[PDB]
């Protein structure tokens, strides 16, 4: 069901190595619905190539547009298992500190602050 279930560590690593080669300016991001989530829909895909100059505030807006949310639906984004300290951090900086050993940046969204 989850990304890390579906692919061997060898396969995730090799995919990041291909993203680096073919989309060198993009951050490879895995975005996943909280497995206890009631309200929010699932995304059309799992793997995202985010332009590396956008800040976290702009990534939240991209995903709220991808889910087609209205303006008083709630949305919370965990990075690398934990809350974001700030939405002003550029995703290039967040990638460098929060990336997984496989080389993806892992994110989870839910309708409640409680996951």
Ligand X SMILES: O=C(N[C@H]1CCCNC1)c1ccccc1
Instruction: Give the interface segment with Cl ion, choosing from 5-13, 22-30, 52-60, 65-73 (CB under 5 A).
Output: 22-30
Under the phi-then-psi rule, with left for phi > 0, alpha for psi from -120 to 50, and beta for the rest, what region is 103?
left
Give me the least distance between CB of 11 and ligand X, in Å please: 27
Taking CB positions, which residue lies at the least distance from ligand X?
41
In this complex, which beta carbon is closest to ligand X, that of residue 56 or of residue 63? 63
Question: SS3 string of 55-100?
Answer: EHHHHHHHHHHHCCCCCCCCCEEEECCECCCCCCCEHHHHHHHHCC
Give me the least distance between CB of 100 and Cl ion, in Å please: 21
Partner from Cl ion, ligand X, none contacting 25, C-beta within 5 to 8 A by type: Cl ion
Asked if 23 interacts with Cl ion (CB under 5 A), we say: yes
User: How many binding residues for Cl ion (CB under 5 A)?
Assistant: 2
In which order are the strands placed within the sheet that holds 76-79? 47-51, 26-33, 105-110, 76-79
CA–chain centroid gap for 53, Å, is 15
What residue ranges bind ligand X (CB under 6 A)? 41, 44, 66-68
Partner from Cl ion, ligand X, none contacting 88, C-beta within 5 to 8 A by type: none
Partner from ligand X, Cl ion, none contacting 23, C-beta within 5 to 8 A by type: Cl ion
**CB of 89 closer than 8 Å to CB of 55:** yes
């Amino acid at each position: 069901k989850t990304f890390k279930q579906r692919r061997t560590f060898e396969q995730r690593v090799e995919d990041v190595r291909l993203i680096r080669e073919q989309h060198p300016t993009k951050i490879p991001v895995i975005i996943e619905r909280y497995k206890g989530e009631k309200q929010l829909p699932v995304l059309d895909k799992t793997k995202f190539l985010v332009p590396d100059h956008v800040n976290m505030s702009e990534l939240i807006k991209i995903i709220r547009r991808r889910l087609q949310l209205n303006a008083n639906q709630a949305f919370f984004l965990l990075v690398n298992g934990h809350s974001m300290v700030s939405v002003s951090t550029p995703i290039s900086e967040v990638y460098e500190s929060e990336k997984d050993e496989d080389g993806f940046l892992y994110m989870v969204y839910a309708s409640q602050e409680t996951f």
